[PDB]
Every structure is written in C-alpha cells, then in structure tokens.
Paper text:
Here we present the functional and structural characterization of Iripin-8, a salivary serpin from the tick Ixodes ricinus, a European vector of tick-borne encephalitis and Lyme disease. Iripin-8 inhibited multiple proteases involved in blood coagulation and blocked the intrinsic and common pathways of the coagulation cascade in vitro. Moreover, Iripin-8 inhibited erythrocyte lysis by complement, and Iripin-8 knockdown by RNA interference in tick nymphs delayed the feeding time. Based on its inhibitory activity, mainly of proteases of the coagulation cascade, we suggest that its main role as a salivary protein is in the modulation of host blood coagulation and complement activity, with possible function in regulating the immune response.
Finally, we resolved the crystal structure of Iripin-8 at 1.89 Å resolution to reveal an unusually long and rigid reactive center loop that is conserved in several tick species. The crystallographic asymmetric unit contained a single molecule of native Iripin-8. Electron density was of sufficient quality to model all residues from Ser5 to the C-terminus, including the entire RCL. Iripin-8 has the typical native serpin fold with a Cα RMSD (root-mean-square deviation) of 1.93 Å compared with the archetypal serpin alpha-1-antitrypsin (A1AT, 342 of 352 residues). The most remarkable feature of Iripin-8 is its long RCL (11 residues longer on the P′ side), which extends away from the body of the serpin, moving the P1 Arg364 17.8 Å further than the P1 residue of A1AT. This extended conformation is not the result of a crystal contact; rather it forms the basis of a crystal contact with the RCL of a symmetry-related molecule. The P′ extension contains a stretch of proline residues that form a type II polyproline helix, conferring rigidity and extending the P1 residue away from the body of Iripin-8. We can infer from this that the extended RCL is a feature of native Iripin-8 in solution and that it has functional consequences in determining protease specificity and/or inhibitory promiscuity. We also observed several molecules of PEG (polyethylene glycol) originating from the crystallization buffer bound to Iripin-8. One of the binding sites was a deep 109 Å3 cavity in the core structure between helixes A, B, and C.
Author numbering: 5 to 96, 97C, 98 to 386
Amino acid sequence: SQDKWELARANNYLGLNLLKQLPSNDKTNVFFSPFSVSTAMGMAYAGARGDTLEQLTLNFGYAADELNEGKVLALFKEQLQSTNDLPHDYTLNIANAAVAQEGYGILPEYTDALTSSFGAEYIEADFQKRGQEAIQKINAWVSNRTHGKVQSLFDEPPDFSTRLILLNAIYYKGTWLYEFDKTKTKPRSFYNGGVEKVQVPMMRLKSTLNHTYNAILNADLVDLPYVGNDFSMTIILPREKTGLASLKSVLTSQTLNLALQNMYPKDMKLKLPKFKLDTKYTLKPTLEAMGITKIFSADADLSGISGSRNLYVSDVLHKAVLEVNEEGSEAAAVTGFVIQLRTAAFVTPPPLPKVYVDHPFIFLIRNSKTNTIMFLGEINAL
C-alpha cells in the first residue's frame, strides 16, 4: 500500500536525520529507535493544532490539509498490531507515555488515540509539589512496561516548571533465522574509532546472505534476517577503516533504498561482534536542530490534548536497549558452487567472499515487509 510506504518513508527520513544530528565521539556507540521517535512525534501530531501541527506535518513535506488524521492514526494502529503479533522469538518491550502536570485537562479522544494508535499511556503527576513521587510513579511504570529491562528514566526530579514530557523506552532481543555457532566465537581485532586495535568477542557465520557492494555509500551491505524474516538487521560497513563519517554524510532514505534493491543472495563468510547497547537521550535539542520547535515553545498549541492551549513539551526522553548474540532458529547453510559437469575432473570452487565487521559501522533493524527502520546504531567502539 502507498500509505504504509509513505509512513515508512517519513519514519526513515526522521531516523537518518536524527543520526546526523545526535552528539557523538569515536569512543561511544549511538543507538535509538526511529520508530519510538516517530511514536513521540505521532503523539504530538494527534494533539497539535494551528502552527504547531503545520510545523510537524511540513517537516515531512505535507500541509496539514494533505493528510487525513484518521488515516495517519490508522497506519500507526496497523504498525502497533504487527509488533504486538510478533512471535515469542522476538523480545520487544515498548513503553510509550505522555506525563502531564495535573489539573490541565485530558480529552478522552486523545487518551483513546494514545492507546489504540501508539500503545501509549497518559499519566498525571505533580512536578511542582511532588517531584520525588512523580519520578517514583514514572520509574514504576517503565519497569512494569519493559518487564524490568528499564528500571528508571529519571535520577532527580525534573524542573518545577515541567508541563508535559514524552517518554519512549524500548528493549529488543531477536532470534536470528541462522544461528551463529557459539563454538566459533573468539576475541578478534576491531578498530575502535577506525584507529585503535582491540580484541573483542566476534561471532562467525558461513551462509547464503543478501549482500551488495554499493559505490555511492562505498560500503558492503549484508542482510541478517530474524525468525519469520519479519525483521532483518542490515549491516552497512564502509570500505575505508575511517569511512563511517563519510558514510553518514551520503546515507539517506533514497541512497539506502537504491542499495537495498541491489542485494542478492550469495555464499559468504561474516564476522560480526557480540554486543549489548543501552542508551538514553534527551531529544528536545536534536528535534529543535531538525526544525521541530513549536511543540517545545510557550506558544505551543496542543489543544487536542487538554481542550485548551495550556500544554507544551518540556522534553522528550528516549531509552533504547539491544542485545546481539549467537542464538538462531536454523543452522547456517551455503548452497555451494553450482557446476554442470560433463567430463570427470578435479573441481576447485572459488574462495567464498568475506564481510569482516572489524571497524566502525552502521546497522539498521527494519521491518522486511514495510522497510520501516525500527532500530539504528553506529558502533564506533567495542
């Protein structure tokens, strides 16, 4: 459907723009869920009016009158049901909420939209008088919704003047279609920051994988499907050891899709690090860098939340957790070299091609059906 495609495109545009705007250095890994950020923007969209709404939509190239709010919420609703219907092999715990200063008003149309479209809760708290209790209620909510994988979003009470905060926490561990062999996992060389050689737990696979070399990105792309090929992890490995910054500067929704369309199966050797990521961002400054300003300003119009223009977003908090290890459903298979033999002979198959993920790279976990990027990582450092 062209509508599902348009939502995946907005989502992927937001994700790759976030990646170019997030603070980073050669010693720390970036990891976030564009899907979670899209959900925080969806929650604002469902309640925004006037110039606040027009800035949100025009950011994605739409006048508010080129959109049906109903059809946008229905596309989010469809996305939510597809994630709730994932098999047991996927551990995906999503926690979405708006937390408002008490006594501003809540429209049931808005809380109904939060539940059905976003799996989101609306929570009232007193940041002025009961800041300490507000963070105990939030920490308990996120702990409950993430099955204890995220215990806290706040260490200290937020500011006296806090009006509304958007919270999006997500945990993911998937099962590979093709298991890596636990016995082949060893410390192997990785270039931290593209420069500093260290030994790190490296998994080893020999299998038929979708792959392409893409000249515009100057990178190998490898697809590793999860079970039911519902999600796949795309590795984008720059050919230059220090190529990551260059890769980031040319990676767009357009250039990614062109590379993905050229992938075809082949037998290959893959070396991929075993790693866990746990990241937390205060997204207001990054979203403002991208041109989302009015939701955060004193002139915000979120009258679709409360029934009046009395709310603005104090901040957007995002926490994302990923585990990557060997576990898969089926053993690794290679097709082998196919030859039509006429005359009996000694036949030497050509050497298998190699993608050794041994320097900084990007990965995307995406919905194979819709090409929605669920997760995006830059690994600089293991």
